[PDB]
Amino acid sequence: GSHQEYIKKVTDELKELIQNVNDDIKEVEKNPEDMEYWNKIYRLVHTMKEITETMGFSSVAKVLHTIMNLVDKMLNSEIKITSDLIDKVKKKLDMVTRELDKKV
Fold first, then answer.
1. The domain spanning residue 10 has which CATH number?
2. Ordered DSSP codes for the chain
3. What's the total number of domains in the chain?
């Protein structure tokens, strides 16, 4: 129904935002200290979090919140940006993708 189309539109939007974050992570991988990509990433994730809260996707929101915490620490120089820190971000983003997949 129209409501089924709505949910499909919303989940497709979330998948596009995730792909956008993955595309920026590929770039920041080449130069981890590039705060321009970390900032864009933070704002993309914040956008996704807003959507998941609206939708009541609580399990996804909690992972997104975790990613924002980590990225915020990187932005406000609370920890040094390593390969391993980037890996934990990637690992969570993949969790987000799986958890979301369960909505269709």
1. 1.20.120.160
2. -HHHHHHHHHHHHHHHHHHHHHHHHHHHHHSTT-HHHHHHHHHHHHHHHHHHHHHT-HHHHHHHHHHHHHHHHHHTTSS---HHHHHHHHHHHHHHHHHHHTT-
3. 1
